[PDB]
């Protein structure tokens, strides 16, 4: 069956694979070393160490689980799917879950930073470490809950001619067009638009209030660092995840009569692009930490 074949040249495949492996080593090393750094730490920074830690985790997972599977079955061999039903559902579930976790962690970091720069005297009277860990757990669980629909949206289908050819066994939405549009819309709003709009607003307010504070010790230095970092994280998240959601909307909103061979090949090269950006997002955070902070850089190099 040559109907499930994706027409992308070997050049793009090798290139994307190379970029993928680079982001793999840089990302995994960066995030793992980040975790180990936050482990041997020793006070709101100690809380943002949890958040950061969480983020690292949310990256590592995607780098250690999502990347190999996606490389193989989504870049190198589009059919048949080789990880079964549980792999099919679990993949997308993990994807969405980690996305939600990352976004919520970003917004939470925005709020915590705001409280850090506006009411530091009320902030030192701190939400305890235990309550912070509880909040991280709450974020993760909420992310899983919001990722639930992927367990029922995706599955295995035999898209071969007779529907009996083992090579036609692919991982795909096992749901009609309209409902798919619905869950994709929900994910686009809740994992991207809404929390990043909130985070961007909060970061603008953070910038302004930082300016006001400057106009009013090492607390100012660390605060400014946190501001620039968080800004960079929000911007990077938006930029990296923007084309991704556009593609998934493109997947279900284009009618059958409009789908040409051009739009097909383009869809898959665009898949390469958007997902490459996704892994860029998966590898960006530890790089930013090393640039802005001399300390974290020294400890990062202490491990390595």
């Amino acid at each position: 069956n040559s109907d499930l074949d994706v027409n992308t040249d070997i050049y793009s495949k090798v290139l994307v694979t190379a970029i993928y492996l680079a982001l793999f080593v840089v990302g995994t090393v960066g995030n793992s070393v980040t975790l180990f750094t936050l482990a041997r730490k020793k006070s709101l920074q100690s809380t943002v160490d949890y958040y950061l830690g969480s983020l690292a985790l949310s990256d590592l997972l995607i780098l250690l689980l999502a990347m190999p599977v996606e490389l193989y079955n989504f870049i190198w061999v589009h059919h048949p799917w080789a990880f079964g039903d549980a792999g099919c559902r679990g993949y997308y579930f993990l994807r969405d879950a980690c996305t939600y976790a990352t976004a919520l962690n970003v917004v939470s970091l925005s709020v915590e930073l705001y409280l850090a720069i506006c009411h530091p005297f009320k902030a030192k009277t701190l939400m305890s470490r235990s309550r912070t860990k509880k909040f991280i757990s709450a974020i993760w669980l909420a992310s899983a809950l919001l990722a639930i629909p992927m367990l029922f949206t995706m599955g295995l289908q035999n898209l071969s001619g007779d529907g009996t050819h083992p090579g036609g066994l692919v991982c795909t939405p096992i749901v009609d067009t309209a409902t798919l549009k619905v869950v994709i819309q929900v994910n686009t709003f809740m994992s991207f638009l809404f929390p990043m709009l909130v985070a961007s607003i909060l970061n603008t307010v953070i910038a302004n209030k930082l300016t006001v504070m400057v106009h009013q010790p090492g607390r100012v230095q660390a605060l400014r660092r946190g501001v620039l970092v968080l800004r960079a994280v929000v911007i990077a998240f938006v930029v990296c995840w923007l084309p991704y959601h556009v593609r998934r909307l493109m997947f279900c909103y284009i009618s059958d009569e409009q789908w040409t061979t051009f739009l097909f090949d383009f869809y898959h090269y665009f898949y390469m692009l958007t997902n490459a950006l996704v892994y860029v997002s998966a590898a960006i955070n530890p790089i930013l930490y090393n640039l802005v902070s001399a300390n974290f850089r020294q400890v990062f190099l202490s491990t390595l």
């Binding site: 109907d3 499930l4 994706v6 989504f74 589009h78 997308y92 995706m154 289908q157 898209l159 692919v170 991982c171 795909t172 939405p173 998934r248 997947f251 059958d256 789908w259 097909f264 869809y267 898959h268 898949y271």
Partner: peptide, 6 residues
């Protein structure tokens, strides 16, 4: 045809 990979 239509893509099957989301």
């Amino acid at each position: 045809r239509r893509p099957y990979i989301l």
